[PDB]
Design a protein around this ligand. Structure first.
Ligand code: A1EIM
Ligand code: A1EIM
Lengths: 307, 307
C-alpha cells in the first residue's frame, strides 16, 4: 500500500527527471545528454521488477498451480535486482577502465552541475523514502531498489564533485585562441591546456563507486540465494533439534528430517518419526508438535512409520 | 566429467582468443581492439558461474546446513546466466541505438575480418560442443552457456558480414587526397565519401541480434524461475490427484496438499490425509504410496490426523 505509493511516486519522479534531461538537452544541443538519459533509463527496469514483485506478493492463495502461493515473488525480485545490479556494475567498471586508458575531455560543466544538483536532491529524497528497509520479505525486496537509489545518488555526488573540479581547476586552453592540450593522446592532429591530472578523476572515483556498490550489495544477494536454495535458517539448530526429538518418549529414531524456509518467518519442516504402538499416537504427535513449536518451526508434517 | 572438460577447454579457448586479440592489437596500434577484448571478457563470468554450479552439483549430501543437499545449484546457475544475459542484451541495445543516432565510421576491415573468422570458427566449434543440451539439471544449466555461445557466434557472423560490406561498398574517400564525408555529422570541422547508407547496418543488424537473443533466452528463464518458485510441474494433475486420493477407501478428506519440484525428476509431496481407525493404518499408507507412485511423485510424507 504505502510502499506501493512510494514506488509509484519514485518512478514518476524518474520519468519527470528524464523529461527534464531531454528538455535541457534540447537547449544545450548535446548528444551526451541523450546518452546519459538513455543510461539512467535502466532504473525503470528495477522499479518495474519491484512493482510486479509487490503486486504478486498479495497472492497468498492456494491454486491449481504452485499450491504454496506466490509468496517467493519478493525473494525472486530481490535476487533479480541483485544480479542486475552486479551486471550493471561490471559494465560500468568496463567503461571506467576504458575512459581511464583514454581520458576524454569534459563538456558543459555549468549545466552538468545544474542537472547534477537536480539529480542529487531527487535521489536524496528517494533515499530518505527508502530508508525504513536498510513481514521481512518486504524489506528483503526493497533492499534492491535501495541499493539502486544509493548508486544513483552516489553517481550524482561524483558527477557534481567532478563538475566543480573542472570548474575550479581546468582553464582548459583548447579552443578559440592559441590553445592545445599536451595530455590528450591525439586531438585529431595532422598554449598547452591547464593541469590535466584531473582528467583521470572520473574513472579513479567511479572505481570507488563500484567498489562500495559491490561491497554493499553482496549481503543481499547472499541472503537471497541462500533462501532460494532451501537452506536451513540461521536461527534453529539441527544438532540439538534431532537430539531432543530422539530423547522424546515413544520415538525410536528419525528416518529423514527436512527443514527449509518458504519465504520469511513462516518455515516448514517434515520428519519420519517412528513409534511402536498405534493405539496411542496422538499424544506423541502433540508432544513433537510442541517441541517444534518451542524450537521455532510451526508448519509440521510427521509420518509415523510403524513397525 | 566430460561436460567439465568441455567447459575447461572452451574457457581455455576463450583466454587464448583474448591473448590473440591483444597480440594483434599490439601490431595494429588500435585501442578499439582493446575495447573489444575487454568486452568479450564478459564470457569468463558466465563460464565460471557454470563451472562452480557443476562443481556444487556433485554435493548431493545431507549436511548440518541445507538438509536437502546442494542440488539446486544447477537451477541457480541457469537463472544467473539468464538474468546476466538479459542485462547484457539491454546494454548492447543501448549502445546500438546510440551508434544508430551517431554513425561512427569503421576501421581496419581486413584485420577485423581475420579476427572475425577466427572468432567464427572458435565459436562454431564451441557451439558444436554445446549442442547435446539444446539428469535434466545438466542441460538446464548448460542452456545458459549455449545461449551465450550462440550470441558469441552471431556477433562473429554479424561483424564478418559488416566487414565484407565495408570491403565491397565503402571506397570511403575520407583521408589523404581531397576527401570528405557528407553523412558524418561533424568530422571535427571548423570529395564526399562513398555510399554512406551502409553506416547504419551495424546497429540495424545488432537490433535483430538482440531480438533473437531475447526470443531464444526467454524459455530458459521462464522454466528456471518457475522451478525456483515451488510451482507444480507440468506433468501431474492436482484436480484428479486429490479426487483419486479422496476416492481411496479409509481416507475421509485431505487438510493440506503440497507438491513441488526439488531440482529435477525427483519431486516431493506432503499431505494431511485423515483416517478413522488407528489399528489399521499401514495398509492405507501403502495404498496412498502406490497411488502417488502411479501418479509420478515418489518422495512422500503423509500424516494421519486421526479423530
Ligand atoms: C544506471 O546507472 C546510472 O544511471 C548511474 C547512476 C545514476 C545517475 C547519477 C543519474 C547516472 C548514472 C551514473 C552517471 O552519473 C552517468 C554516467 C557517465 C556516462 C557520465 C559521464 C560524463 N561526463 C562519463 O563520461 C562516464 C565516466 C562514462 C559516466 C559513466 C557512469 C555513469 C553511466 C553512472 C555513474 C552510472 C550509474
Ligand atoms: C559479451 O558479448 C560479446 O562479447 C559479443 C559477442 C561475442 C563477440 C563476437 C566476440 C564480441 C561481442 C560482440 C561484438 O562483435 C563486438 C561488439 C562491438 C563493440 C563492435 C564494434 C565494432 N566495430 C562496435 O562499434 C559496436 C557496434 C559498438 C559493437 C557492439 C556489440 C559488441 C560488444 C558485440 C556484438 C556484443 C556481443
Amino acid at each position: 500500500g504505502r510502499n506501493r505509493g512510494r514506488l509509484l511516486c519514485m518512478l514518476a519522479l524518474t520519468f519527470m527527471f528524464m523529461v527534464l534531461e531531454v528538455v535541457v538537452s534540447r537547449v544545450t544541443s548535446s548528444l551526451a545528454m541523450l546518452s546519459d538519459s538513455f543510461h539512467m533509463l535502466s532504473d525503470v527496469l528495477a522499479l518495474v521488477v519491484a512493482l510486479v514483485a509487490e503486486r504478486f506478493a498479495r497472492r497468498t492463495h492456494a491454486t491449481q498451480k504452485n499450491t504454496f502461493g506466490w509468496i517467493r515473488a519478493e525473494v525472486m525480485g530481490a535476487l533479480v535486482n541483485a544480479i542486475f545490479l552486479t551486471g550493471l556494475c561490471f559494465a560500468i567498471l568496463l567503461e571506467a577502465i576504458e575512459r581511464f586508458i583514454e581520458p576524454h575531455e569534459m563538456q558543459q560543466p555549468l549545466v552538468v552541475l545544474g542537472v547534477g544538483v537536480a539529480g542529487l536532491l531527487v535521489n536524496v529524497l528517494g533515499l530518505c523514502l527508502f530508508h525504513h528497509h536498510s513481514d521481512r520479505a518486504g524489506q528483503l525486496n526493497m533492499r534492491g531498489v535501495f541499493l539502486h537509489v544509493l548508486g544513483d545518488a552516489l553517481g550524482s555526488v561524483i558527477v557534481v564533485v567532478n563538475a566543480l573540479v573542472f570548474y575550479f581547476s581546468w582553464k582548459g586552453c583548447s579552443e578559440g585562441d592559441f590553445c592545445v592540450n599536451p595530455c590528450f593522446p591525439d586531438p585529431c592532429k595532422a598554449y598547452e591546456a591547464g593541469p590535466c591530472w584531473v582528467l583521470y578523476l572520473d574513472p579513479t572515483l567511479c572505481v570507488v563507486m563500484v567498489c562500495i556498490l559491490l561491497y554493499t550489495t553482496y549481503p543481499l544477494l547472499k541472503e537471497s540465494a541462500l533462501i532460494l536454495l532451501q537452506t536451513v535458517p540461521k536461527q534453529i539448530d539441527i544438532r540439538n533439534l534431532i537430539k531432543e526429538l530422539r530423547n522424546v518418549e515413544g520415538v525410536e529414531e528419525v528416518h529423514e528430517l527436512h527443514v527449509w524456509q518458504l519465504a520469511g518467518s513462516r518455515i516448514i519442516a517434515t520428519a519420519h518419526i517412528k513409534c511402536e504402538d498405534p493405539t496411542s499416537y496422538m499424544e506423541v504427535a502433540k508432544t513433537i508438535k510442541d517441541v517444534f513449536h518451542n524450537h521455532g518451526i510451526h508448519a509440521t508434517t510427521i509420518q509415523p512409520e510403524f513397525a
